[model samples]
Target: ITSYAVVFDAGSTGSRVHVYHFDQNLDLLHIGKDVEFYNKIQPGLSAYADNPEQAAKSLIPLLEQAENVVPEDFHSKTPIRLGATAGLRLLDGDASERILQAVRDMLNNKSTFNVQPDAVSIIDGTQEGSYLWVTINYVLGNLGKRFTNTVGVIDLGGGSVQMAYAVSKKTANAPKVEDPYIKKIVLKGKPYDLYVHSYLHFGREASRAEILKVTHGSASPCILAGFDGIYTYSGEEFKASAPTSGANFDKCKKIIQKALKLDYPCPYQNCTFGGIWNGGGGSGQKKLFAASSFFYLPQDVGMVDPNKSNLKLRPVDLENKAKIVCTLNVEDVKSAYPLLEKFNIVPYACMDLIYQYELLVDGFGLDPLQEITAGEKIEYQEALVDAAWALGNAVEAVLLLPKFE
Candidate 1:
């Protein structure tokens, strides 16, 4: 026997639906030719913050795709969930609440899949981080193995960045602070302590806004040489113009460093930027898998091969790319990196590249030459699966079906 699970990742930049099929043993099964039925739409739910109904309706197309692939007989048995991430978390007032209520109402009234009262809501950063850890380790077949065998994860979304990895029991038992940075969970009967933290406003897109904020509407060295435009993020506009000298690698690095608050005091023995603990570096943190913006930005700029799902690279690669990109004027970007034009990220390419490098080395405390895998998907059982947190949410939902039955 088999079961189906549907998960919607309402991220800061996009809304994506993942329909997964799992066998009785909880192993992922094929959906058509793919491991999961995935669909995505841009602009995210937060874009419709003012109109909750529109936000809810935006997911209709994704829902239709899921329903088309899932059998009607199992519709009522399939559990569907929607987890909004940092995008909605940044909303100012009751906007996020209203949007969630509208989504919940829509799902209950129109969708045939099983929906719980808590199905539609904003998931905290910790949940996002833990799920990311599970997704990577589970895909790598390391869940049942020792904690040291599991790999660490760094997920750079549009609005927040999550760092999660398994840590030694000694580090996990180290004093409990007011903030819950460690999550203990049992996977495949093996218990493990996971260190996870999400740095809000540290994601690629949001960090751009942060950098612009630091400029205070002045001529920013992070902007492309010939570009002078306003940067809009989360409903706020910022003056984004380059100085006469254009984008400079050294100048941009300094701005990004300030935006990252690299100089912030760290009361902890070991800390990442903004005084966050660095997970007490252990064997679990030895191997890392970076996803989302970490993969897209590099691939768009040709730093990493676009043909491959995963590429091993060091932070220095990003620094080298940034040096070249920072030297180019906005007018020269099209010829240098055609994809940047297609993605409409030409003005901030230099800033994005520099931020990625600094975030890895200065913000996260990773060695510049340390090897890490950057990818958007991972191959499992000869099938390509999206390397995102939705799969991990599906796994947990399906595993709990027996309890409700």
Candidate 2:
């Protein structure tokens, strides 16, 4: 018997749907030529802030696509869920709630799949991180293995960044003040202690806004030499322009550090930026897999081959690229990285590269020379699967499904 789960990722930048199929043992099975059916649309659900109905309707195409992939006989048995991320978390008033309600109504009225009452809602950062951890480890075939065998994950979305890795019981029980930093779960009969945290406003796109805010709308050394534009994020606009001397790598590094708030006092034994605990480094974190912007930005800059499934690189590689990018004007930067198709991205290539390097080294406490794998997809069982949290969500949904007596 086969089970199906439809998971929608309502991210800050876009809305994406992932339809997955699993065998009775919970092993992923292929759907046509791919392991999962994946599709995406721009401007995310948050873009329709004022019109909740429109926001929900925007997902119709995605729903239809998922339905097309799953056989109609199993439509009523397939569980569908939508997990909204930092984008809606940033919305003010009841906009997010209204949008969610509309989506729930839409799913219930139109979709044939099983939709739970709480299916459409915003997931907290910790939940996002945990799902990310599950996705990576599951793909790596380390779910039931010892905690030390599992790999750490750093997911850089548009609105937030998550760091999750398995930690020993001792470290997981470490003293904590407010919110619990450790999530304990049993997978394949093995209970594991996972350390996960999400830093809001630290994602690639949101961080650009933070950088511009720190500059106070003045001429910044991070902007490209020949490009001057306004940077908008979360409905706010900021003046973005370079100084007469143009973008400078060393000066830009200082700005990023300031934006990271490295001076925050740490109350724990160890801390990442903004006074967050660094999850007590151990074997679980020894090997890391970075996804999302961590992969796309490097690929866009030609540091990683677009055709490759993954690349092993150190934080210093990003720094090296930033140094050269900062020296070039807009035209030079474009020619140097012909892979970049978006015109707007060319202007902030220097800033984006520098910020990623700083975030990995100074922000997350990773050594500059420490190598990590970066990729948008991972190969499992000779099939390519998207390296995102949706797959993890799907697996959980399938596991929790009702069984026959």
- Clashing residue pairs in candidate 1, if any? none
Separately for all candidates shown, the number of backbone clashes (residues 3 or more apart, or on different chains) is 0, 0
After superposition on all CA atoms, how large is the RMSD of candidate 1? 3.1
Q: Model 2, poorest ten-residue lDDT window?
A: 396-405
How would you encode candidate 1's per-residue C-alpha lDDT over 1-405 as one tens digit per residue?
889999998987899999998887677889888888988998789899999999999999999999988899989989999998765766879999999999999999889999987788777877888888888888888878888889999999888898999987888845457348889887776788999898888988889999999989699999998888999987899999999999999988999999999888987877888888887887898899999899998788777665787788999999998888899998888787888899888999999999999999988878899999998988789887777778888877776687422
- Candidate 2 stretches greater than 4 Å from native: 11-15, 39-68, 72-76, 89-92, 235-237, 338-343, 402-405
RMSD for each of the candidates: 3.1, 2.9
lDDT of 2 by residue, 1-405 (tens): 889999998987789999998887678888878888889988789999999999999999999999999999999999999999765856889999999999999999899999987788787877878988888888888988999899899989888898999999888757656447898887766888999888889988899998888899598999989888889887899888999889999999999999999988988887888888888988999999998899989888877764786788999999999988898898898888765647457888999999999999999888999999988888788787777778888877786775410
Provide the lowest-lDDT 10-residue window in model 1: 396-405
Runs of candidate 1 exceeding 4 Å displacement = 11-15, 40-77, 89-95, 105-112, 174-179, 215-217, 235-237, 403-405
